[PDB]
A and B are shown apart, each in its own frame.
Chain A
Amino acid sequence: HKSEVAHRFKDLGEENFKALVLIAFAQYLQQCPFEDHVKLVNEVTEFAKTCVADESAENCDKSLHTLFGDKLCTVATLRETYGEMADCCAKQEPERNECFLQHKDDNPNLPRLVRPEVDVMCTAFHDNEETFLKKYLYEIARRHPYFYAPELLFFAKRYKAAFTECCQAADKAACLLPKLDELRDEGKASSAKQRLKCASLQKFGERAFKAWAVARLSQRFPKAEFAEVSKLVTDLTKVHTECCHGDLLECADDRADLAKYICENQDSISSKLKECCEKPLLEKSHCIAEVENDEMPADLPSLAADFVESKDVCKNYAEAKDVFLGMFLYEYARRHPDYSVVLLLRLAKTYETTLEKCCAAADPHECYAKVFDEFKPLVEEPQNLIKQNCELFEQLGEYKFQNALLVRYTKKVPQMSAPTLVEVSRNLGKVGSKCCKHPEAKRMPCAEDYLSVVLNQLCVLHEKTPVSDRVTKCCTESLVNRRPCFSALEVDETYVPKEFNAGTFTFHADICTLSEKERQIKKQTALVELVKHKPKATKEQLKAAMDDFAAFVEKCCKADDKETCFAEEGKKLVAASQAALGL
């Protein structure tokens, strides 16, 4: 178009345009103060209104990359505050926008989002609603630079709703706080999911995302024809490719167009969309995206006929491998609405590898005839794994379960630092809380989808600051087989252990003034260190060494002279610990 900034403002309207630019700015420049970003958004908006009023006004044909970059580089040149982003401002477009995209920080060193008291929030909401809600967008966007922008608009609407509803409740806290906690959790999940979506596009290629989409949509829309599902997948793929590349205005605009198309072609898509399609734009798109699975069309013929028995299997596969496997995935996925997509993708992959081998054999039909018998074990391995972990989670409680995983992952990746390993164990450990409470049939798909999400977070950060070649291999070899790869890792024996050294051991009394849960993180650091001093350590050697640690912290924290005791009892703990581990 003659003016991209006019076109998007006209298609999106001012409210959403401004919200999306705020999001864009906050995601490129995560460290930038709220007030500066709002300033930049207002000026871009002033410029959009001008171009809408007169599409030939000066600079109205500049790309949105150039405009946003121009605005970001009025502050991002300050290296003291903005770091490697100053390099991006030293460049011209398009290299400049590409540099910003590479510096999106997945682990921002940013303060926890503590709530004020309910009254202070409600007062702030009444006094300046507009500013209050932009801060929400800012604070979430900047902590989650790949958060799906259109959905964040929806989250902002829900956040507004909670305040509108609760700030005059008889008990404001009781109304408001549970709403805000739900949103916080849904936002974290949503961001984590989108990050995995962007990673699959960017690091495993467009077909990786298309296969995920066909799978999920076929479960959701199982009465739609393959052709209809592909159309939807193509549009969905364009949408996410634009969002994941920081092209948020175009992303939100194409998404609205997808939503509209779906709602005008319901008879071709699903019977569950009627109420979704009566709603306003953001609710509409959110609803369509979360709508319950349509009923499956009944007495469906087997997959044997088209994917095993037919004489045209190898031919149809040879001309159009991704399409043919798309058809497989569509037919399999729509019949199994209860399966994790990761599992479905793993089965499609298995079928793909089978045809790759067998269609070059003298008798392809006989070679691949039993291909479906490969599946049942691949369905059962995770079920059993999750059953064992859930039982273990229930027997140990959350803290000891995390401890058990922390030992596991330190053994797997001793090159990681203690705080990383503690974070990874905490997040893996949440699989038990989030999934093990669900009925057995929903446990496994919950667990497998959540674990893929957490591991992907570990992977995108590890690629930036790598420490284990094994992690890199598990991160890069196969997206769908990530969890099994990390599961199969035994103790790393390339790693040279930390030697014990009484003389450099230093521990101060500052742990005594810590809370229960802050003191637990110290016990967890102690655990990580023990393992790094002997990766092959057994559970019972570690139990003993940990018992020495806890007795050492309990002795000196109750002692009259606390700092002397940690000084004095340090040499013996080290000797005791070393003995516990068999040296």
Chain B
Amino acid sequence: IQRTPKIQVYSRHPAENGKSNFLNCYVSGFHPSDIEVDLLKNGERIEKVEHSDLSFSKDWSFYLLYYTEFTPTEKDEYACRVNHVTLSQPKIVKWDRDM
């Protein structure tokens, strides 16, 4: 069997231009466990992004949290890029603030 990842992008605290924060990409509900995740800043891969342990849910499906410290601005555009055997093409989800 195979399951497609679900992808959420959100910040740790309510976003405030100028204030330091963490940006989070939570990928869940997938199988098998091999998955490629990148955060993007103005379209560019961010270099040193941290991630939690690949863990799993009651239904055996995998999940994973990628994060980086960031300071929101009006100008800067963030997103999460995810690749996985079930995806015919890599999937980009944009950070839409407080949504």
Chain A interface residues toward B at CB < 8 A: 501-504, 571
7 new A-B contacts, CB < 8 A, other than A501-B50, A503-B67, A503-B69, are A502-B69, A503-B12, A503-B22, A503-B50, A504-B52, A571-B20, A571-B69
- Per-residue CB contact flags for chain B residues 42-54 toward chain A (1 = under 8 Å, else 0) read 0000000010100
Q: How far is the CA of A504 from the CA of B50 in the complex (A)?
A: 10
Q: How far is the CA of A501 from the CA of B50 in the complex (A)?
A: 8
Of the A-B pairs whose beta carbons lie under 8 Å apart in the complex, a sample of 10, sorted by A's number, is: A501-B50, A502-B69, A503-B12, A503-B22, A503-B50, A503-B67, A503-B69, A504-B52, A571-B20, A571-B69
- B-side binding surface: helix, strand, loop or mixed? strand
Chain B interface extent, by class? under 10
Min C-beta distance of B34 to chain A, whole Å: 22
Q: How far is the CA of A501 from the CA of B67 in the complex (A)?
A: 10
In the complex, residue of chain A having the shortest beta-carbon distance to the beta carbon of B65: A503
Min C-beta distance of B16 to chain A, whole Å: 14
Min C-beta distance of B70 to chain A, whole Å: 11
Min C-beta distance of B24 to chain A, whole Å: 9
In the complex, residue of chain A having the shortest beta-carbon distance to the beta carbon of B20: A571
Interface positions, chain B 39-96, Cβ under 8 Å from A, are 50, 52, 67, 69
In the complex, residue of chain A having the shortest beta-carbon distance to the beta carbon of B69: A502
- A-side binding surface: helix, strand, loop or mixed? helix
Min C-beta distance of B13 to chain A, whole Å: 10
Chain A residues, CB < 8 A from B69: 502-503, 571
Min C-beta distance of B23 to chain A, whole Å: 10
Q: How far is the CA of A310 from the CA of B69 in the complex (A)?
A: 78
Q: How far is the CA of A504 from the CA of B12 in the complex (A)?
A: 12
Q: How far is the CA of A274 from the CA of B34 in the complex (A)?
A: 80
Q: How far is the CA of A502 from the CA of B20 in the complex (A)?
A: 12
Chain B residues, CB < 8 A from A503: 12, 22, 50, 67, 69
Chain B residues, CB < 8 A from A571: 20, 69
Q: How far is the CA of A503 from the CA of B67 in the complex (A)?
A: 8
Chain A residues, CB < 8 A from B20: 571
Q: How far is the CA of A571 from the CA of B50 in the complex (A)?
A: 15
Interface positions, chain B 1-45, Cβ under 8 Å from A, are 12, 20, 22
In the complex, residue of chain B having the shortest beta-carbon distance to the beta carbon of A575: B69
In the complex, residue of chain A having the shortest beta-carbon distance to the beta carbon of B24: A503
Min C-beta distance of B9 to chain A, whole Å: 16
Min C-beta distance of A578 to chain B, whole Å: 12
Chain A residues, CB < 8 A from B12: 503
Q: How far is the CA of A503 from the CA of B22 in the complex (A)?
A: 8
Q: How far is the CA of A501 from the CA of B65 in the complex (A)?
A: 14
Min C-beta distance of B19 to chain A, whole Å: 12
Residue of A503, A504, A571 with most chain B CB atoms under a 10 A cut-off: A503
Q: How far is the CA of A571 from the CA of B13 in the complex (A)?
A: 13
Minimum-distance CB pairs A-B, first 3: A503-B67, A503-B22, A501-B50
Q: How far is the CA of A504 from the CA of B51 in the complex (A)?
A: 10
Chain A residues, CB < 8 A from B67: 503
Min C-beta distance of A75 to chain B, whole Å: 38
Q: How far is the CA of A503 from the CA of B69 in the complex (A)?
A: 8
Min C-beta distance of B98 to chain A, whole Å: 20
Q: How far is the CA of A571 from the CA of B22 in the complex (A)?
A: 11
Q: How far is the CA of A504 from the CA of B68 in the complex (A)?
A: 11
Q: How far is the CA of A347 from the CA of B52 in the complex (A)?
A: 54
Chain B residues, CB < 8 A from A501: 50
Q: How far is the CA of A445 from the CA of B68 in the complex (A)?
A: 56
Chain A residues, CB < 8 A from B22: 503
Q: How far is the CA of A451 from the CA of B67 in the complex (A)?
A: 47
Q: How far is the CA of A335 from the CA of B87 in the complex (A)?
A: 83
Q: How far is the CA of A331 from the CA of B71 in the complex (A)?
A: 77
In the complex, residue of chain B having the shortest beta-carbon distance to the beta carbon of A572: B20
Min C-beta distance of A571 to chain B, whole Å: 7
Min C-beta distance of A487 to chain B, whole Å: 38
Q: How far is the CA of A36 from the CA of B84 in the complex (A)?
A: 60
Q: How far is the CA of A571 from the CA of B20 in the complex (A)?
A: 10
Q: How far is the CA of A50 from the CA of B9 in the complex (A)?
A: 79
Q: How far is the CA of A503 from the CA of B50 in the complex (A)?
A: 9
Q: How far is the CA of A501 from the CA of B66 in the complex (A)?
A: 12
Chain B residues, CB < 8 A from A504: 52
Q: How far is the CA of A502 from the CA of B69 in the complex (A)?
A: 8
Q: How far is the CA of A501 from the CA of B69 in the complex (A)?
A: 10
Q: How far is the CA of A496 from the CA of B73 in the complex (A)?
A: 36
Chain A residues, CB < 8 A from B50: 501, 503
In the complex, residue of chain A having the shortest beta-carbon distance to the beta carbon of B21: A571
Min C-beta distance of A502 to chain B, whole Å: 6
Chain A residues, CB < 8 A from B52: 504
